[PDB]
Amino acid sequence: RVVGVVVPLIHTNFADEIIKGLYETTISSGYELLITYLDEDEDHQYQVFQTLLSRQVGAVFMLSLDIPSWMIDKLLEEQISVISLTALLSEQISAVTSNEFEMMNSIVDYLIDMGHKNIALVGDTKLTTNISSTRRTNFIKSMTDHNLAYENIFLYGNDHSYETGYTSVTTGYDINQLPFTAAIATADMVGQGLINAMSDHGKTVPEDLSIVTIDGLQQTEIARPKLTTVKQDFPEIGRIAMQLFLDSPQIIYIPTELIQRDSVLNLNS
Amino acid sequence: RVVGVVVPLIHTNFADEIIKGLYETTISSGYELLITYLDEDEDHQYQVFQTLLSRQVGAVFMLSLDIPSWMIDKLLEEQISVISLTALLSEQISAVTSNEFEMMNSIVDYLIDMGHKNIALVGDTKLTTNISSTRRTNFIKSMTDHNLAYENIFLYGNDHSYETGYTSVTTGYDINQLPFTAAIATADMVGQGLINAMSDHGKTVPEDLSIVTIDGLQQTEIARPKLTTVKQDFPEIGRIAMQLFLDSDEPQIIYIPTELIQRDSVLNLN
Ligand SMILES: OC[C@H]1O[C@H](O)[C@H](O)[C@@H](O)[C@@H]1O
Ligand SMILES: OC[C@H]1O[C@H](O)[C@H](O)[C@@H](O)[C@@H]1O
């Protein structure tokens, strides 16, 4: 009675929170949890798969979004259950996730209510050949649904790192003449990068830039000012996913919450 | 051709860095890496052990200080190599670690050179029945080796959390009249807690409190002020532990060097 979890070698702190939930449910049901890491090297990825097959796992939980199709097919073809978390990896399998459009729309709704019109999405905003640009597309859809235009929509960045947040307002835009009043950060660390870049250049959040992040992990509480954030319930994603395996395709959505803290200015005030 | 790594459920981010090192050496030697978590429940611990020998691991790397003796013994008795990382778990096994006294002594030496005399250790400072209070003991030894006295030595905390750092100078001591001028934080997040507690109560680091942390991970770079820190080479610890296993067919301790990185969180009082 073993289940596997595949975690990217490069991941936000959210993996540990998902794993805490998976672990709670595996322990109480008589299963053990094996954790394995996945790099972007096809040959190493295959070695790993032989390690999932050869520990005769009953299920594999995927957190990545960057999993090769042959891995999912090979696992399913061995009668192993495959369930993806925080993303919809394949038509063929079930997923447990926060609802991406609802998260994004909750932020845009809020920032517009707070008087913002010119808004940036900062973090993982790139277009690629094989991976959906989920947040980029949802941001643009939500902004346009709220009757804002292309001229109000700003994008920056290739990943969820602190560095991307930091560079967005140093190399990306003119920190002394920012064309947006608010930034939606695709992960908490991007938000911290923004805070520090502003502070390091003698500016202050939220007076000089409002920020909202997605994930709502510890860093949003450690930041000064404390970051307004859409908090995901990562442990619940894990628990619900394991329970889905135990009870046996579909998509199950776990709700999120926009937590209002100290990083947004009311421009109507 | 598999090795296992046992990680505590409650861990600083040092584990990931060790795992990065382990992984690079396993990859290039044709081994695969199984990661398992360990909680405080003896019955769950035994299941984890059953998962380790049933997956026929050649070696098990231990990161915790809290592993039961019976697990180490049962693994060794199955002819599985056991090596501990960042801690010397048993006299029966090899270990790869930063040198704890050298780390602590380097920090105390620096703080005293910078004019500090009244110094706190904040973080995991508790005495227990079964786990050596390594940092507490080394702090005290170093302070007394430098001819300071018990009246100069302050302690606070039971763990390496942000909350322990934050609470140390708010509910542990009087934030308005701290009896120490510098705090040695046993983990980076403790240092972050200290910075925030000071900032939230109208004070500023380092003007009102100097801080040095142990570990030197990303939090020390994103903190403001940036934290002066003893940086451990966690990936090197991981690589060397795996290399020890690969090179083996008695038990040794291999010390991995550290370095004190001076940033923005210490004031010279002289
Ligand atoms: O951590 C930032 C993001 O990482 C991954 O893309 C997850 O799918 C997403 O839920 C998370 O917000
Ligand atoms: O992260 C704080 C401490 O945690 C663990 O106890 C490690 O053994 C130690 O090396 C580290 O400094």
Side-chain angles (χ1 to χ4, degrees), chain A residues 1-55 57-269, chain B residues 1-64 66-270:
Chain A
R1 316 289 261 191
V2 186
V3 301
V5 59
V6 175
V7 176
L9 198 54
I10 322 159
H11 60 290
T12 304
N13 294 298
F14 84 80
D16 287 352
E17 287 283 283
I18 293 181
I19 287 160
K20 183 167 155 287
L22 287 179
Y23 188 77
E24 287 170 28
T25 311
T26 59
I27 218 76
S28 51
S29 72
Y31 276 78
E32 262 304 315
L33 184 56
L34 287 177
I35 298 86
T36 197
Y37 288 88
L38 213 78
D39 61 25
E40 285 179 290
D41 187 287
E42 167 181 299
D43 292 312
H44 299 161
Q45 290 169 350
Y46 192 67
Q47 306 324 315
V48 166
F49 158 80
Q50 290 170 150
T51 280
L52 295 162
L53 187 177
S54 66
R55 319 310 135 181
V57 302
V60 175
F61 299 93
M62 305 289 188
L63 279 66
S64 289
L65 217 189
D66 212 345
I67 305 297
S69 299
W70 58 257
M71 191 178 288
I72 295 165
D73 285 306
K74 284 182 98 77
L75 291 161
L76 293 169
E77 292 167 16
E78 303 274 17
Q79 297 90 72
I80 296 167
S81 294
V82 176
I83 293 172
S84 67
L85 305 179
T86 82
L88 306 96
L89 260 181
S90 169
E91 329 80 52
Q92 301 156 300
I93 67 178
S94 286
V96 185
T97 187
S98 301
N99 187 299
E100 285 277 351
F101 183 78
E102 290 306 309
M103 287 194 283
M104 183 65 67
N105 195 61
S106 76
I107 301 170
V108 169
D109 252 331
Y110 173 71
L111 288 173
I112 288 175
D113 282 351
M114 296 288 275
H116 299 270
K117 178 179 54 161
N118 293 315
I119 302 172
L121 182 69
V122 180
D124 193 346
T125 74
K126 69 181 179 300
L127 296 160
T128 67
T129 301
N130 298 305
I131 305 302
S132 297
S133 201
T134 305
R135 290 180 184 168
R136 183 198 177 105
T137 295
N138 288 337
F139 174 61
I140 291 163
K141 173 176 166 50
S142 184
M143 292 282 287
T144 56
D145 285 352
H146 285 82
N147 310 123
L148 299 177
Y150 167 100
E151 69 191 308
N152 303 125
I153 292 168
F154 299 84
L155 308 168
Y156 186 92
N158 294 130
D159 64 37
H160 296 298
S161 70
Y162 175 89
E163 172 91 321
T164 293
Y166 203 100
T167 65
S168 68
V169 294
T170 56
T171 63
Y173 295 95
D174 180 352
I175 201 163
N176 295 314
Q177 298 291 165
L178 289 175
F180 44 87
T181 57
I184 303 177
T186 65
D188 304 322
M189 280 293 183
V190 178
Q192 190 61 55
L194 288 157
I195 284 174
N196 282 0
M198 300 303 283
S199 194
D200 290 349
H201 291 80
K203 316 284 175 195
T204 300
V205 170
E207 182 188 339
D208 297 314
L209 178 67
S210 290
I211 307 166
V212 179
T213 78
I214 297 167
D215 284 349
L217 305 165
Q218 196 188 23
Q219 188 63 39
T220 63
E221 300 157 32
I222 293 165
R224 295 288 184 277
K226 288 177 174 199
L227 284 158
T228 297
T229 192
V230 173
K231 190 158 175 64
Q232 303 196 236
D233 198 340
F234 293 115
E236 184 74 1
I237 290 168
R239 283 193 293 269
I240 292 291
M242 179 66 186
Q243 202 57 60
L244 185 65
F245 167 63
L246 293 171
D247 291 353
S248 68
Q250 46 181 130
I251 304 151
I252 301 177
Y253 293 116
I254 307 305
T256 66
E257 184 188 351
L258 175 68
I259 301 169
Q260 298 170 39
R261 308 201 174 117
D262 295 318
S263 63
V264 182
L265 189 66
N266 185 341
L267 300 191
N268 306 311
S269 205
Chain B
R1 215 157 176 77
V2 176
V3 300
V5 187
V6 178
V7 184
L9 258 192
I10 303 159
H11 57 285
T12 302
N13 267 327
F14 81 90
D16 277 22
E17 286 284 282
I18 287 177
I19 287 170
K20 273 156 194 172
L22 280 175
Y23 188 84
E24 54 186 319
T25 302
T26 62
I27 230 72
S28 53
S29 58
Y31 274 80
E32 260 307 318
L33 184 58
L34 266 44
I35 306 294
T36 62
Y37 291 99
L38 198 82
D39 64 13
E40 212 73 57
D41 180 290
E42 202 146 60
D43 286 51
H44 299 154
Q45 292 175 348
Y46 189 74
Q47 299 308 310
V48 169
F49 162 78
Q50 288 176 130
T51 293
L52 293 165
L53 76 163
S54 65
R55 277 61 215 179
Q56 306 173 236
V57 300
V60 174
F61 296 100
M62 308 285 191
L63 312 205
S64 311
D66 228 332
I67 302 292
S69 300
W70 59 257
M71 189 181 292
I72 293 164
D73 286 305
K74 283 182 153 299
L75 292 163
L76 293 170
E77 295 168 13
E78 299 287 343
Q79 294 76 54
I80 297 174
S81 289
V82 181
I83 294 166
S84 64
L85 283 61
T86 81
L88 321 148
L89 284 181
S90 169
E91 62 288 341
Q92 298 163 297
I93 70 175
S94 294
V96 183
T97 183
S98 300
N99 188 294
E100 284 277 352
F101 183 77
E102 192 178 309
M103 288 197 283
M104 182 68 64
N105 193 62
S106 76
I107 298 168
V108 167
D109 205 59
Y110 174 62
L111 286 175
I112 290 169
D113 283 354
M114 294 296 276
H116 298 269
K117 272 176 69 264
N118 294 313
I119 305 178
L121 183 72
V122 182
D124 187 353
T125 71
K126 63 187 188 294
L127 296 160
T128 69
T129 301
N130 298 118
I131 296 163
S132 300
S133 201
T134 306
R135 293 187 176 165
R136 180 199 180 104
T137 290
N138 287 335
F139 175 58
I140 292 159
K141 179 181 193 317
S142 181
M143 292 282 282
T144 59
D145 285 345
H146 283 84
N147 304 317
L148 299 180
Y150 302 119
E151 74 191 320
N152 304 125
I153 292 168
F154 302 80
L155 302 170
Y156 183 92
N158 297 315
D159 68 34
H160 297 294
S161 72
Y162 172 88
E163 287 79 11
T164 291
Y166 197 97
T167 63
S168 66
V169 291
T170 52
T171 59
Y173 294 93
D174 176 4
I175 197 157
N176 309 297
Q177 293 181 215
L178 290 176
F180 45 89
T181 61
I184 299 173
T186 64
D188 302 328
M189 273 289 194
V190 175
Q192 179 71 82
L194 285 163
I195 285 174
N196 282 356
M198 302 307 285
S199 297
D200 288 349
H201 297 84
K203 295 195 174 288
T204 307
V205 171
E207 284 59 49
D208 299 310
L209 179 66
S210 288
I211 302 168
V212 178
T213 78
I214 293 166
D215 283 353
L217 297 168
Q218 182 185 37
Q219 206 70 35
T220 67
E221 304 158 16
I222 72 184
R224 292 286 182 282
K226 290 172 172 278
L227 286 156
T228 295
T229 191
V230 171
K231 192 174 208 295
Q232 303 201 56
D233 197 346
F234 292 115
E236 180 70 359
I237 294 163
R239 289 192 289 274
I240 295 297
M242 185 58 193
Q243 200 62 46
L244 190 63
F245 167 66
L246 292 168
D247 288 351
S248 70
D249 290 304
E250 189 58 60
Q252 52 179 139
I253 298 176
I254 297 165
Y255 293 114
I256 306 299
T258 67
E259 56 197 17
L260 193 161
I261 303 178
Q262 180 199 302
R263 302 207 176 105
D264 297 320
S265 66
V266 180
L267 197 73
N268 184 286
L269 306 183
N270 290 321

